[PDB]
Nucleic acid binder design. Structure first.
Lengths: 43, 155, 105, 76, 49
RNA sequence: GGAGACGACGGCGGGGGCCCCGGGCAGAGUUCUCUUUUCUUCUUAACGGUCUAUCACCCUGGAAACAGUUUGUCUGGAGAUAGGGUUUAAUGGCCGGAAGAGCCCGACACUUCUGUCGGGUCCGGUGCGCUCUCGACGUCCCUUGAAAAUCCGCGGGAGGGAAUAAUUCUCACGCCAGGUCGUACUCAUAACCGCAGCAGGUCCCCAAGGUGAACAGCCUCUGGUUGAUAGAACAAUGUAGAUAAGGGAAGUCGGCAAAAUAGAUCCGUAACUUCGGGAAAAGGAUUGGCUCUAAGGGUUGGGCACGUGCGUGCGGUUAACAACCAACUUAGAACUGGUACGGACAGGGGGAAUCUGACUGUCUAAUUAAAACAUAGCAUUGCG
RNA sequence: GAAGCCAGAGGAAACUCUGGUGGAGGCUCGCAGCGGUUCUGACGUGCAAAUCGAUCGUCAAAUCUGAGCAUGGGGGCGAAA
């Protein structure tokens, strides 16, 4: 956060990395291989 | 690679300032290949150029301060800086009071609570600063009607 | 008496077992406030599950879909899914939860 | 732009020799339909309620005058 | 006698209601001409001939 | 004959825009905790139609027990009040323009070419607010505050005019035409002048939020910049900003400089005076926060008998009552922190006298701003 | 806070007193603007052949200012230095 000087870019305007999403869900304890995030990933 | 022209064109297309234009730092070559407003619009549709949102300016503290000044806080002699007439004009107060009194007198004369002679003398007393407010005028009218009723009963 | 029907769709993250529909039900039941006080639902607002990872809300008061989206985003922030799940209105009174756009690196 | 409140006056306006074209604008939220005929000086608009008689008025309009239905998007 | 605010308000409301009734009658007349459009077109064509 | 066509200043009222508050749809941000949260979009042109808008004018009628009436005392037997109408004036409401636009959001497609399709774009309030415009008043003058091009109305009745029909109709629609030159950009701490990309100078329009009396100072939004050689160290002497025990002008030609005073509410205020002033004289008391109390407003609405929502003939001034709505001031009281309470910023030191010029004003651009000059007042001379 | 105006208390009246209203003045504090008082000021081959800072005067007018035009050296203009 730097809300004094600038606004935060909306989350929908930045494409999320599949590696970071998989890492976060794997830390949360979700079997990513059983759900197939690669198919949902765009290119 | 220089992107000043692309930033200016993106600002003109998005209808914002040049400080609100965000150019993708990872696809600089494709942004530099855009030399026309059609290409800039195509990159905006692709999401490579976006308009940054406005910086925060909230009115929340002003609204809480307005509520505090409404319920009566921060009105003390340490808070007052202008003179009493500068804060609230006696001319505006007199205008409000005279309009209230004349409106009430017109309403009473229309409804028939008073006649035109009582209306005229009460009008000139209101102009001559006899009544402080509507309650004072109403009490004076009630006392005058009571005295007239007593005189009629005596006669 | 007017009745408003709201659907919070979480079918896809419920199928991924990412979003806990029962925990979201409990969170809504303990955080939806009526007349400025939490735990004051009574018969005014009812929360149920219609299945397939969907939450169904019946409101006889002036409950707002903006308020429901606000509480859904609060629940996502609690469950550390605010950076990864998005609440999007798809119909009149229907808010679905979906992943943000994903790039393959 | 002028609004015509008389069906007879609109018929004579459409049968005038200067009438280049006419168009149909349907507003379903307002439940209304607009007949707009283009002449040399003025664009004349007749406002009616959405009804089968309003749709039938197209048949009583002159066949020589071209009539078009306005699409949802004014594509440039 | 001098009229009061109640009389003035009723005068204002009657004038507004009269305007509303005139507008409603105008819409009804336009509607009736809309069902009688074909005879109107026949009369216009006959006058032109 | 009207228009073109006209000063400065003051308060009041209407309208547009901006600012502010509330609800709703959508989007975004915050989320240890709290926050039904905070912010963003929610717009409507020219040109027209239609219904209304202060002044004023018209009709009835004849006013003292004078009345109407503005914040501001003007109006009325040269006809007021009242009742009923006619009109100058829209940047007012509705409709056409025009949602088909613009804006916001979403779902697919997309090597490019390119996009495609949905959902909306809504409902209110407030004001000694800022700004522009309009209107009625008012004040000042030994000052009385342009002209012309051009356009219109009227007086007048010369002519021209009908039933082979006539029409020289400022009505509606229709037909035709509208040449020449300028148009980029800067308008300034780099586009002009100063020899220069020079801290100088150079005429205007639009002007957000908070504090506050305030287009003061300080902080923020939109929009702009982040440009004015850099790096390291922290000696003297400087320049700029501060503090200092005790004493308090002992310093010095000379309190030079600096310090002290300062906003607001209340108490109170001398000599002198041309009676207007002096005067913010002097000298004192107080000022935060929190929880309350009190006062100061707007809108709507009266019973019968008939004819049938109005017309009458009545009857009454406890509506002194109910319902709804709304904002900023003022006074009072308790509690409470304290070394500070106009906590930064902002912001008179005061007094006793003398000389001097009546005052406001003006000049020595680039060493002198003054008892100099001017000023109103007074007196003299010349001119029919 | 000047005329003008309203109400009340007196006074035979003319006038006197009290509370308001009103908004005059080549009035006054003071932002901009215009000007230029003082500092052992800065600067002194300067940013500048007159600049910078603080302080000061005035601020509804004998105020400030643009463009067009007029006055030309035996001259003009001059609230006169």
């Amino acid at each position: 956060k730097s809300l004094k000087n600038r606004a935060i870019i909306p989350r929908k305007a930045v494409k999320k990395p599949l590696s970071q999403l998989e890492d976060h869900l794997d830390q949360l304890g979700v079997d990513t291989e059983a759900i197939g995030l690669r198919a949902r990933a765009q290119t | 690679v220089n992107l000043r022209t692309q930033k200016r064109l993106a600002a003109s297309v998005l209808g914002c300032g040049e400080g609100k234009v965000w150019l993708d730092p990872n696809e600089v070559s494709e942004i530099s290949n855009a030399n026309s407003r059609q290409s800039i619009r195509k990159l905006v549709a692709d999401g490579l150029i976006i308009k940054k949102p406005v910086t925060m300016h909230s009115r929340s503290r002003a609204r809480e301060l307005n509520l505090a000044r409404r319920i009566g806080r921060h009105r003390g002699f340490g808070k007052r800086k202008g003179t009493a007439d500068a804060r609230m004009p006696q001319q505006v107060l007199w205008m409000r009071r005279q309009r209230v009194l004349r409106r009430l007198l017109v309403k009473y004369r229309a409804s028939g609570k008073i006649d035109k002679h009582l209306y005229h003398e009460l009008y000139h007393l209101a102009k001559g600063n006899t009544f402080k407010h509507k309650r004072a005028l109403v009490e004076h009218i009630h006392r005058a009607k009571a005295e007239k009723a007593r005189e009629r009963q005596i006669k | 008496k007017v009745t408003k029907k709201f659907i919070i769709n979480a079918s896809q993250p419920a199928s991924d077992k990412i979003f806990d529909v029962s925990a979201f039900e409990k969170f809504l039941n303990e955080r939806i406030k009526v007349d400025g006080r939490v735990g004051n639902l009574g018969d005014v607002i009812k929360i149920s599950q219609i299945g397939d990872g969907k939450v169904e809300i019946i409101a006889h008061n002036d409950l707002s879909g903006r308020y429901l989206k606000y509480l859904t985003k609060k629940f996502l922030k609690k469950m550390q899914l605010r950076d990864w799940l998005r609440v999007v209105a798809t119909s009149k009174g229907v808010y679905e939860l979906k992943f943000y756009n994903i790039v393959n690196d | 732009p002028q609004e015509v409140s008389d069906i007879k006056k609109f018929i004579e306006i459409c049968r005038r020799k200067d009438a280049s074209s006419a168009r149909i604008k349907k507003n379903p939220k307002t439940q209304q339909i607009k007949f707009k005929v283009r002449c040399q000086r003025f664009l004349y608009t007749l406002v009616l309620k959405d009804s089968d008689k309003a749709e039938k008025l197209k048949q009583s309009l002159p066949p020589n005058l071209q009539i078009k239905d306005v699409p949802k998007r004014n594509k440039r | 006698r001098r009229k009061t605010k109640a009389e003035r308000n009723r005068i204002k409301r009657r004038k507004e209601e009269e305007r509303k009734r005139k507008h409603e009658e105008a819409m009804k007349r336009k509607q009736q001409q809309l069902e009688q459009a074909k005879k109107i077109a026949a009369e216009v064509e006959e006058r032109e001939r």
